[PDB]
């Protein structure tokens, strides 16, 4: 332990040659001690802040991973969507103008319209979390900044 060693040090040497004629020495050695104390302090304040900002991002990183890919699932449901009503658009565009099936198939439209616009709502939430998660991550780009410029 060099701060023990170093107080014994400083002990053996006033021993003989006084302390008056080593206070310089002796102020110096106070001042070490000090200093390695605060560094000490901040080591371990750093460490732990390391330990926990790295877990955080591992985690919001999973969470970014996980909404993207369910964003994807999402455009999947809208082009899908997307499809059935040109699909019937045109089927009910070629109708004999009349005719017994025009009534039903405009329901399945208007259906199907309905839950296109939910989808498309329950996109953009998607998006915005998302969006919202790599803001997250940001700040935590931003407090370990934080962190380094005041070791």
Do not use: C
């Amino acid at each position: 332990n060099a701060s023990s060693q170093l107080t014994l040090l400083i002990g053996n040497l006033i021993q003989i040659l006084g302390e008056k004629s080593l206070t310089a020495l002796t102020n110096k050695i106070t001042a070490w001690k000090s200093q390695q104390q605060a560094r000490q302090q901040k080591n371990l304040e750093f460490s732990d802040k390391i330990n926990t900002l790295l877990s955080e991002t591992e985690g919001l990183t999973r969470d970014y991973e996980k909404q993207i890919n369910k964003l994807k699932n999402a455009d999947s449901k809208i082009k899908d969507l997307e499809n059935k009503i040109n699909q019937i658009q045109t089927r009910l565009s070629e109708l004999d103008p009349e005719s017994p099936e025009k009534k039903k198939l405009s329901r399945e439209e208007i259906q199907l319209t309905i839950k296109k616009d939910a989808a498309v709502k329950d996109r953009t939430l998607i998006e915005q979390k998302t969006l919202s998660i790599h803001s997250k991550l940001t700040d935590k780009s931003m407090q370990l900044e934080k962190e380094i410029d005041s070791f």
